[PDB]
Amino acid sequence: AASGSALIFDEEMSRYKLLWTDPECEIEVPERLTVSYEALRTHGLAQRCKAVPVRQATEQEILLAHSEEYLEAVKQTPGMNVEELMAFSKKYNAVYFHQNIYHCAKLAAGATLQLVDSVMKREVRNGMALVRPPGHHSQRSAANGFCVFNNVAFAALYAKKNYNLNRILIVDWDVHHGQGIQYCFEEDPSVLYFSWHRYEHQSFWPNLPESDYSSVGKGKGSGFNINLPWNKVGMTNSDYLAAFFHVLLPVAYEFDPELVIVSAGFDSAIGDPEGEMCALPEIFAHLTHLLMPLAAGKMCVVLEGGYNLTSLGQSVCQTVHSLLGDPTPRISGLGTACDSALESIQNVRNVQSSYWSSFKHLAVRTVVVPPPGVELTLPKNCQHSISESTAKEVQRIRDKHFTDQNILRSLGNIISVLDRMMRSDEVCNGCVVVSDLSVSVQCALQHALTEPAERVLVVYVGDGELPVKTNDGKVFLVQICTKETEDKCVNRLTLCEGESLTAGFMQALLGLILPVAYEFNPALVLGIVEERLMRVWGHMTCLIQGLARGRMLTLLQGYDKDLLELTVSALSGASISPLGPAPKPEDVEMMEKQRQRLQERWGLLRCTVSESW
Ligand SMILES: NCCc1ccc(C(=O)CS)cc1
Ligand SMILES: [K+]
Ligand SMILES: [K+]
Ligand SMILES: [Zn+2]
C-alpha cells in the first residue's frame, strides 16, 4: 500500500494580513504559517514529508460548498482599496479582507484538495496542509471567524464526488465550533462531524444554541453530528482523552469511516489567548495516533486556528511526528476529567444513545525472533536477533530459579530485545515467538523491571494465571479470557464466543483498556497470546503503542504465521485494515460492572458525574 506523509504549504498564503486596527482579528497573523513551517524544519519533519505543491481551487470546486453570489462578492475583493475592504469586512462577523485574501483562500482550498487527492490516490499514507485562511466557520453565503471558504467541507464533498466515498469522519479539535461544517452536513449521514469547543453555556463565540450537545443532526443525518461543549476553561489532557475514549472513538470505530479529515485548530492548546485551555501540545500526537487505525490510516489534517506561536509550532510538530509514525511521548499525571467535562460527556452520550447503542445506560523500529529455522519476509523496518553477557544472565536465571536449549535461547532473545528497547535507543518494539509461557513471562517481566521500567502493562490473551504479581503498584494486568473471574485486585482487569465478540472487544478496548492504560502510564507494554483474536489484535497493538513511547514486547506462544505477520506489521507501523461497521447485552453489562468497579481508582474511566455521598 501507500507510504509517506504529505506536507502542503506555500509562503504565498502568508501574504495577506489585517490592514486596520481590529482587536477581534489582531491574532490571525501571517506568522502563524511561518513559525509553523519553521518548526517542522527545525526538528526535521518537513524534510521527511512528500512536498505536494499548492493549487487554486476551481470555481466549480468552490461552488460545491458556497453559492454563486457569495463567490462573486469575494471575487470582487482583490480590486478594492482599504476603505472598501473594511466596509466589506464589516458586512460579516469577526473577519477581515485583504487584496490577496481571495487568492490565498483559493490556495487554501486547493491545498486541501491536493492533500485529499494525494491520500486517496495512495500516493501517501496521510498528510497535513499548513493553510491560511482557516475554513470551518465559513458558510454557504458568508465569511465568518477568520474564514473565507470552508476547506474541510470542500475536502469532504470533493472526496464524496470524486471517489464515491460513503462514509467520511471529520474531527474538529479546534477550540471553536466549526458551525460551517455542521451546517454543511447536518442532514448528511455520509459525513459524520465531531467537534469539541469552548462554549461556557453559549456565552462564548460564536454564541450559538445549535453548538450545544442537543444538536445531533437533522432528518436523515440525526446522530451524525456530535457537539461536545466545554462549559469551563482550563480543560486538560485528561478531559480531551476522556472525550476521545468515551465519545469520539467508539462512535468512530462503529462508523468505520473510509476517510478521516481533521480540522486541526491548535487554539485548544495551552497558552492560546483565544481558547484558554491547558492541554499540552503532546496531546495532539496521541489524538492523531488514536485516529490513525481508522480508514486504513488515510487521514487528512488541515490547519485551522491556533494563535500562540510557540504552542502552535510545538503542536504542529507533535501532529506531524505522529503522522510519520514516530513514537508518541508519554503523558503523565492523567486522571479523571473535571466535573464540567464529565457533565458534557454524560449529556452528549445520553442524547446520542438513541443513535449509537454503546451509549445507552440502565436506570531500526521492530525486531522479530521467529522459531529456530523459520525465516520470513519481514517489512523494510524490521530485523532479526545473543551476547555473552546475555548468556551469563540466562545461566544465572536458570541456576537460581529454573534443560532445553531452544527455550534458553528464547529467554536470551527476550533479554536481548528488552536491552535493545530500554537501555538502547536502537530498537523500538519487538515480537518473540516462544514456548513455555511461564518461564518466558517470568524472565521478561523481571528483566524489564530492572531495565529499569517504573511500570509495566501486561496484556494477556488467554486463560489461567500467569507468573505476575499485581500486589505492588508497578504492574497492571489486562487479561482477555474465556472463563469468569470475580476480579478483586484493583490492579487487574479480567475480560471474558460468537460474531459479536469483535464488536465487544473494540468497545472494551476503547471504554476500559485504553483509559486505564493511559492513566497508568507504563514504561513498557508486555503482550502475551496463548495457544478470533485475528480480527482485533492488530488494532489492539497499534492503539496500545500510544503508551510507553511504543516500547512493546509481544510474546507469542505457538507458531501461527498469520498471527506473527499481523503482530509484526502492526508493531512496525504499517496501516491497519478496517474492521468494517453491536455488542452482546451480557458483554456490555460485564463491561459496565468492570467500569463501576475500577473507576474510583482509575478516574479516566469516568463518563458520568460522580454522585456525592
Ligand atoms: N472572539 C470573537 C472573534 C473570533 C472568531 C474566531 C476565532 C477563531 O479562532 C476561528 S478558528 C477567534 C476569535
Ligand atoms: K471544534
Ligand atoms: K453529519
Ligand atoms: Zn479557532
Instruction: Choose the final residue of a domain: 319, 345, 363.
Output: 363
Please check whether residue 594 is in contact with residue 327, taking contact to mean a CB–CB distance below 8 angstroms. Answer: no
Q: Identify any residues that bridge with 263 across adjacent strands, giving them in sequence order.
A: 172, 302
* Ramachandran quadrant class, 468 (left: phi over 0; alpha: psi -120 to 50; beta: rest): beta
Question: 3-state SS of 380-418?
Answer: CCEECCCCHHHHHHHHHHHHHHCCCHHHHHHHHHHHHHH
For 75, phi then psi, to 5°, come to: -60, -30
Q: 428-467 burial string, b = 16+ CB within 10 Å, else e?
A: bbbbbbbebbebbbbbbbebbbebebebbbbbbbbeeebe
Whole-angstrom distance, CA of residue 565 vs CA of residue 568: 5
User: Residues 539, 579: contact at Cβ < 8 Å?
Assistant: yes
Residue 326 Cβ < 6 Å to ligand 1: no
Residues 350 and 387 both lie in one domain: no
**Cβ-proximal residues to 573 (8 Å cutoff; 6+ apart), any chain:** 325, 365, 381
* C-alpha cell belonging to residue 90: 464589516
Instruction: Yes or no: say if 407 and 435 are a contact pair by the CB < 8 Å rule.
Output: yes
In a domain, 612, yes or no: no
CA distance 19 to 517: 50
The total number of structural domains in the chain stands at 2
Confirm whether 613 is domain-assigned.
no
Of 363, 379, 407, which residue sits at a domain end? 363
The answer to whether the beta carbons of residues 200 and 172 sit under 8 Å apart is no
CA distance 99 to 104: 10
Question: From CA 66, how far away is CA 72, in angstroms rounded?
Answer: 10
**CA triple 260-266-269, angle to 5 deg:** 125
Q: How far apart are CA 61 and CA 527, in angstroms?
A: 48
Mutation test residue for ligand 1: of 198, 263, 274, the one with most atoms within 8 Å of CB: 274
Please give, one letter per residue, the 3-state secondary structure of 247-302: HHHHHHHHHCCCEEEEEECHHHEECCCCCCECECCHHHHHHHHHHCCHHHHCEEEE
Burial 576-612 (b: 16+ CB within 10 A, else e): bebbeeebeeebbebbeebbebbbeebbbbbbbbeee
Buried b (16+ CB within 10 A) or exposed e, 286-315: bbbbbbbbbbbbbbbbbbbbbbbbebbbbb
Q: How was this structure determined?
A: X-ray
> Rounded to the nearest whole angstrom, what is the distance from the C-alpha of residue 52 to the centroid of ligand 1?
29
Dist. CA 508–CA 501, nearest whole Å: 10
Q: Is residue 490 packed enough to be buried (19+ CB in 10 Å), middle (13-18) or exposed (0-12)?
A: middle
The dihedrals phi and psi of 342, each to the nearest 5 degrees, come to -65, -40
What is the helix (H) or strand (E) element at residue 368, kind and residue range? strand 366-369
Cβ-proximal residues to 87 (8 Å cutoff; 6+ apart), any chain: none
Q: What separation in Å is there between the alpha carbon of 226 and the centre of ligand 3? A: 8
Residue 183 vs residues 46, 110, 141, 189, 323: alpha-carbon distances, Å: 34, 21, 12, 13, 29
Is 267 touching ligand 1 by the criterion CB < 6 Å? yes
Q: Which of 342, 363, 384 is the last residue of a domain?
A: 363
Q: Which atom of ligand 1 is nearest to the CA of 265?
A: 11
Atom number of ligand 1 nearest to Cα 274: 12
Q: Residue 450 is placed in which grid cell? A: 530492572
DSSP-derived secondary structure letter, 362: -
Cβ of 203: how many Cβ atoms within 10 Å? 9
Q: Is 303 in the pocket of ligand 1 (CB under 6 A)?
A: no
Q: Which has the closest alpha carbon to 164: 190, 134, 130?
A: 190
- Tell me, in angstroms, the distance from the centre of ligand 2 to residue 297's CA: 21
Distance CA 437, CA 407 (A): 10
Residue type, 203: S
Q: Residue 171 falls within a domain, yes or no?
A: yes
Question: Backbone phi, then psi, for 598, in 5-degree steps?
Answer: -105, -15
Give me the resolution in angstroms, 1 decimal. Answer: 2.5
Whether 80 and 198 share a structural domain: yes
The CA distance from 421 to 429, in Å, is 6
* Cell triple for 376: 520470513
Classify residue 98 by burial, with Cβ atoms within 10 Å: 0-12, 13-18, 19+: buried
| One domain for residues 326 and 418 | no
Residue 262 grid cell = 481533521
From the CA of 191, how far away is ligand 4's center (Å)?
21
Alpha helices by DSSP H, listed for 76-216, are: 82-90, 101-120, 151-163, 179-185
H/E run at residue 349: helix 339-352
Same domain, 61 and 161: yes
Spatial contact of 121 and 1, defined as CB atoms under 8 Å apart: no
In a domain, 342, yes or no: yes
Q: Are 194 and 169 in contact (CB under 8 A)?
A: yes
The set of cell numbers assigned to 544 is 496500545
* Contact assessment for residue 578 and residue 256, using Cβ atoms and an 8 Å cutoff: yes
Q: 320 and 420, same structural domain?
A: no
Residue 507 in contact with residue 431, Cβ under 8 Å?
no
Cα of 147 vs its chain's centroid, Å: 25
Distance CA 75, CA 62 (A): 12
| Backbone angles phi and psi of 126, in degrees to 5 | -155, -165
Burial of 396: CB neighbours in 10 Å, binned 0-12, 13-18, 19+: exposed
Q: Are residues 235 and 383 in the same domain?
A: no
Rg, the chain, Cα only: 25
DSSP state of 511: I
CA 4 to the chain's CA centroid: 18
Tell me, yes or no, whether 351 and 430 share the same domain: no
Alpha-carbon gap, residue 126 to 46, rounded angstroms: 14
Ligand 1 atom closest to residue 305's alpha carbon, by position in its atom list = 11
Name residue 140's amino acid. Answer: R
Measure the CA angle with vertex 64, ends 62 and 68; round to 5°: 60
* Interaxial angle between packed helices 309-324 and 282-291, expressed in degrees from 0 to 180 and rounded to the nearest 10: 30
Residues with catalytic function: 137
Atom 9 in ligand 1: residue holding the nearest Cα: 305
- Residue whose CA is closest, atom 7 of ligand 1? 145
Residue type, 285: A
Does 137 sit in the ligand 1 pocket, CB within 6 Å? Answer: yes
Phi, psi of 480 (to 5 degrees): -100, 120
For residues 546 and 289, the answer to whether their CB atoms sit within 8 Å is yes
One-letter identity of residue 240:
Y
Strand order in the sheet with 126-129: 5-8, 126-129, 299-303, 259-264, 168-172, 191-198, 225-230
Contact 26, 80 (CB under 8 A): no
Whether 443 and 411 map to the same domain: the answer is: yes
User: Phi and psi for 61 in degrees, rounded to 5?
Assistant: -60, -40
CA distance 574 to 582: 27
Residue 167 and residue 298 in contact, taking contact as beta carbons nearer than 8 Å: no
Within 8 A by CB and 6+ apart from 139, the residues are: 150, 179, 180, 183, 184
Q: Which ligand is nearest to the CA of 94?
A: 1
DSSP of 20-87: S--TTTTT--THHHHHHHHHHHHTT-GGGSB-PPP-PPPHHHHHTTS-HHHHHHHHTGGG--HHHHHH
Which range marks the domain in which residue 494 is found?
364-606
Sequence-separated (6 or more) residues with CB below 8 Å from residue 282? 237, 318, 328, 329, 331
Q: Is the N-terminal amide bond of 206 cis, ω within 30° of 0?
A: yes
Q: Which of 322, 332, 135, 309 is nearest to 241 (CA)?
A: 332
> How does DSSP classify residue 484?
-
- What the block records as the C-alpha cell of 558 is 505457538
Q: How far is CA 532 from CA 328, 434, 586, in A?
A: 29, 20, 19
Mutation pick for ligand 1 pocket among 18, 22, 24, 233 (CB with most ligand atoms within 8 Å): 24
Verify that 516 and 537 share a domain, yes or no.
Answer: yes
* Helix 101-120 vs helix 68-75: crossing angle, to nearest 10: 130
- For residues 402 and 488, membership in a common domain is answered with yes
Point out which residues pair with 252 in neighbouring strands. Answer: none
Whose alpha carbon is nearest atom 10 of ligand 1? 145
Q: Which residue has the cell 518461564?
A: 439
Torsion of CA 403, 407, 412, 418, to 10 degrees: -140
Q: Could you tell me if 351 and 382 lie in one domain?
A: no
Q: Is the dihedral of CA 413, 415, 418, 419 positive or negative?
A: negative
Q: Is residue 176 part of a domain?
A: yes
For the record, the C-alpha cell of 456 comes out as 509495566
SS3 547: coil
| Cβ contact 461:555 at 8 Å | no
**Amino acid identity, residue 78?**
P
Looking at residue 127, what DSSP letter applies? Answer: E
CA of 30 to the centre of ligand 3 (A): 32
CA distances from 545 to 491, 526, 539, 554 (A): 20, 11, 10, 12
- What is the C-alpha to C-alpha distance for residues 495 and 483, in angstroms, rounded to an integer? 9
Are both 392 and 286 inside the same structural domain? no
Residues of the chain with a following break (C to N over 2.5 Å):
363, 385, 402, 496, 531, 581
Please give the distance, rounded to the nearest whole angstrom, from the Cα atom of residue 235 to the centre of ligand 1: 18
C-alpha dist (Å) from residue 292 to 33, 161, 301, 552: 25, 23, 11, 18
CB of 282 shorter than 6 A to ligand 1: no
- d(CA 226, CA 192) in angstroms, rounded, equals 8
86 grid coordinates: 473594511
Q: How far apart are the first and last CA of the chain?
A: 55
Cell numbers standing for residue 313: 509550532
Distance CA 312, CA 267 (A): 8
Q: Letter for the amino acid at 522?
A: P
Beta carbon of 180 within 6 Å of any ligand 1 atom: no
